[PDB]
């Protein structure tokens, strides 16, 4: 029943929500809606597609100096290893971003040139 939700508006005053869910398995899920149906993405696919990341820099962005907080460290074990388990490929930013474009090509009405 947990989750977080932002409503981001564009400079032309048009909105887009990006709801994050919490799964009881341990992982989290990015949710959006491009047309009148919803779509679910794990956020480590997006954390590694925005910029060129390490995997300790994903850890250091959530964990501050509170490494000894063992609630957060155990829930972040399951988040980063679930990305390596479910997606054993997709190691760098340019490979995660091609998977995310292959799955959202017919729905975002893409062009054959891109």
């Amino acid at each position: 029943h947990y989750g977080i939700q932002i409503r981001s508006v564009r400079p032309d005053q048009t909105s887009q929500t990006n709801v994050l869910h919490y799964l009881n398995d341990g992982q989290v899920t990015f949710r959006f809606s491009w047309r009148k149906n919803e779509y679910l993405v794990p956020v480590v696919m997006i954390l590694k597609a925005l910029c060129h990341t390490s995997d300790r820099e994903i850890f250091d962005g959530i964990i501050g100096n509170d490494v000894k907080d063992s609630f957060l460290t155990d829930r972040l074990e399951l988040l980063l290893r679930g990305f390596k388990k479910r997606y054993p490929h997709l190691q760098n930013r340019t490979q995660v971003l091609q998977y995310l474009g292959d799955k959202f090509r017919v729905v975002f009405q893409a062009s054959p040139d891109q």
């Binding site: 932002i6 959530i62 964990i63 100096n65």
Partner: protein, 58 residues
């Protein structure tokens, strides 16, 4: 860019939904009281009176 900080032990300074930086809970109230004192005293040329400064204390 060079912060190495996260979590509720700090207060995250955000303008319009982007991180400007990180500062302590005690200092983040001190630097939220000037931002009201300097927006009302209209002598600082970067702070409008239109600004909404929401300090959520720990």
């Amino acid at each position: 860019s060079h912060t190495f900080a996260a979590g509720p032990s700090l207060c995250c300074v955000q303008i319009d939904g982007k991180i400007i930086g990180w500062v302590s809970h005690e200092q983040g109230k001190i630097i939220a009281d000037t931002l009201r004192y300097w927006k009302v005293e209209g002598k600082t040329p970067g702070l409008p009176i239109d600004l909404e400064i929401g300090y959520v204390p720990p």
